[PDB]
C-alpha cells in the first residue's frame, strides 16, 4: 500500500528480473500488467503469484518489436486496469558473440527487443503521461551498456542506446512532471565476480527495490539518471 | 518502522538538507545523532522535532575539521545510541568567488568542512562497519561536484573530491558488505532554473527520500554510485 | 606526412564533418576512402580537394545499412588503397521530432545509418585489424548521445548506442592492440549557445583535429574513451 | 616547431610523467619551466635534456603547497621565459593505506600537493590567461580519481577533486577562450594488468602525447573534459 492502486506496465515481466519487478511493484500496491513474448505459463504464474498474495495483475502477450501490436496491448492494459503511471521496459533478447560473428538475425533481434520496444511503449504511453502531469518511466540498462563488454557489442549497444533514450525522454517530458530513469544491473542470479567488489552475484529483488523506488514519489525530483545495481562493478 | 532502530549519524544535520535527512531517517525508525558546528538552537529544535513525533535522537556539537574532536563525538554517539549503521556526511561550508579571488581562509574552510570531515568520520566508524558486515555510508556530493561550476571552484573541488572518496571507500569495504554512495542535489529550496529541465527547485525532503533509500536494505547491492537529485540538471 | 601512407576509411565523408575529417586525415599523409550515400558530386569534390593538395584518395558510394553492400565497398577499398588501419564511422541521418511523432521510417533510417553502419564496417575490417596488431576505430558520437536531447530521442539513442558499441569493441580488441574511441561533437557550423560555455559554435576542422589525434600513434594507449568537442557543453 | 615558442609551466616536471611532459612540450617548440619539490639534480637533468636537443627550458624549486611561494615562482617564470600559455599541474604526493590508517600527515601532504597546488598555480596564471584570450590548463587526474581505488582514498579524493576543479575552471574561463582539461593516466611504467584490457603498462611519452595535444591548437574547442590514458582501464 505505497503505490496507491496506480498502474504499472512491465514489458518482459514474464520471468527473472522482470518477474521480481512485477511482484515488487504489485506488493507496493500497484496493478501490474505483465507483457511478454512469451511463454504464457510463467506469465500467468507471475500473475497467479501477485493474486495469491492479494495483488491486482493482468497478462498480455505482445510483440514489443511490432510497431504497434504494442498499441493494441497498451490500450488493452488501459482498458483493463486504467491509465499507466509507471512504465518498466525490461523486454530484451541476448545473443552474444564477437562483433564479426554477429549476424543480422542476432543484431536486429537484440536491437528491436531491447531498444525499439522501449521506443514503441513510450510512444504509446506518452500523451497519457503528459495529460496527467505525473509519470515514472524505468528503462532497464545493463552495466555492459555503461562501460561496454567484449563479445556483447550487439547487446551492449542496445543497452547504451537505451540510456540515450532515457536521457532524451527525461529532457523531453521534464516540464510536464514525467520522470524517466535507467537501471543498470550487474551480475544477477537467478537464471565471474572479479570485477565485482562485493564478490557476490545480486538477487533480482535487489534490482526490484531500485525499480520500486524509481517508480514511487520518493524519486519525484530524480530524472535522467542511470543507476547501477552491480555491487560496485561499474562504479 | 523501516530502519529497525538502527543508528544514523548525520553531520551538518543542524539545518536545511541535513535537517530533512535527520527527520526522514528518524521517521523510518532510526535513532539519529545530529552533529553540527553549530547553532545549538536549530539542532535541539531538530531533535525536539524528531522526539515530538516519537523518534529517538541526540545532538552533538563537533568540529568536523578537527582530526578527532570527531572521534570524541563518534564514540559519544556510540555510547548514547549504539554502534553506527548509517553515516551521512552533510557538513559543508560554501564560499564562492572566482578562482583568483579565492583565499586560503575560504579554500581551507570549504575543503576541511566538506571533504576532510567525511574522511575523519569514515575513519571513526570504519572498524565498526567492518566488524558488523553491514553499513551504509552516504556522502553529500553537489551537482557542481559532478560537472563543475563557475565561481565555485573551491566548493566544487571539495564535492568532486567527495565523490572520489565515495568510490574509494566503496571499493575498500565492499567485501565486508559495507556500502558507500554519493548524493548530488541540484537547485534546492529552502534557504536559475534554465539548466533544470523540470523548471523548478527541489524540496529537501525529496533529497531526504534518496538518502533514506540509500540507507535501507532496498539498496543492499548498490555501492559506489553517484545519484543526482537535480531535476535532470546534471543528467 | 604523419600518417605514413596508412589507409583511412571515412563513412559519411561526403560532406561537412566527414569532409573535414577526410581532408585532415589526408593532409597527415593517409590514403582516404570516401564512403557516402550519397551525392557523388560532393564526394569527388572532396577527393579532388585531397588530390589538389597532393593527397591520395578514393570514393565509394555504399549503403551503410545494407548488411554487406558494405563488404563489397570495404574490400574494394582494400583492393584500391590497401588494408585499413583507420576507420571513421560518420554516416548518419537526422530526423527529429517528439518521441510520439517518431515513425518507423524515421526511426529505422536513423538507427541503421547511425548505428548499424558502424557495426557492419567494424565487422568488415575486424580480422584485418586483428591480424595487423594495429588499428584505430573512431566512431562519431553526438553530445546528444552523451546526455540526451529533447525531440531527438531517435538520433540520441542511436548515438548513445554508438558509444556502447565503442566500449564493447575496445574491450574486444584491446589485447590485439586495436583501439576504438568515440568523438562527441557539440554545436558545429557549418551547415542556441546558452548551454555552450565558450559561447560559440565549433568549426569542423576542430573536430577533425580530434579524429586525427585519435587516429595516430599519439593515442596508442587511449581506448574506450568518449571525447567531447562541444565547447564544454556536455562536460 | 608546433608550439611556436609559447611558454609551458609543468609543476612536478622533475621526474617520470612530468619529465616526459616537459620533454614532449619542449620538442613541440615550447619554452618549458620545470617546477619541482624537489631534487634539483633530476630537474636540471631534464632541462639539460631539453637543451641538448635544442629546446628552451628553465627550472624552479617551489613549494606548490605554500599559498604563494608559488606566485614568486610564477612571475619568476614570467620574467625568465614570458607569460604562460600552457599550465600542466603534475605535482603530487602518494601515500596509500586503508582509510583508517590514513593520517593527517599523509592526508594533508597528498591533498596540498595534488589539489591545492593546482588551485594556487591557476590563481597565479589566471589574469594572464584572461587578458590573452588564449590558454590551455592541463590537470593530471588519476584513473583512481575517476572510479576510486581501495586503500588510496586520500590520493583518489585529491584526484577527483582535481577533476572538479578542472570542470569549474573550464566553465569559469570558457568565454575568454581559456581551456581547462584533465588527464587520467592508468598503470604507467616507469618507476596488476587484469583490469587493463590492453594487458600492458603505459609509457610516459604516451601520456605526454595527450598533454601535448591538449596544449596545442588542435584541441581549441575541447574544454572541461576528462581523458583517460589507461589502456581502457576506466572506460
Residue numbers in the entry:
A (entry chain A), B (entry chain A), C (entry chain A), D (entry chain A): 5 to 195, 206 to 249
Paper text:
Superposition of SiaM, EryKR1, TylKR1 structures indicates that a variant form of LDD motif (IRD) can be found at the same location in SiaM. Noticeably, the second position of the LDD motif is occupied by a basic arginine residue, which has not been reported before. Although SiaM crystallized without NADPH, the superposition of SiaM and other KR/NADPH complex structures indicates that NADPH binding cavity is present at the same location in the SiaM structure. In addition, a water molecule is found in the vicinity of conserved Lys163, which was proposed to be involved in the proton relay. Similarly, in the other interface of the tetramer, the aromatic stacking is found between Phe227 residues from neighboring protomers.
However, a recent study has shown that, in the biosynthesis of a symmetric polyketide dimer SIA7248, a trans-acting KR SiaM iteratively reduces the β-ketoacyl intermediates attached to different modules of the PKS. The overall structure of SiaM resembles the consensus structure of KRs involved in the fatty acid biosynthesis as well as polyketide biosynthesis. It harbors a Rossmann fold which is responsible for the binding of NADPH molecules.
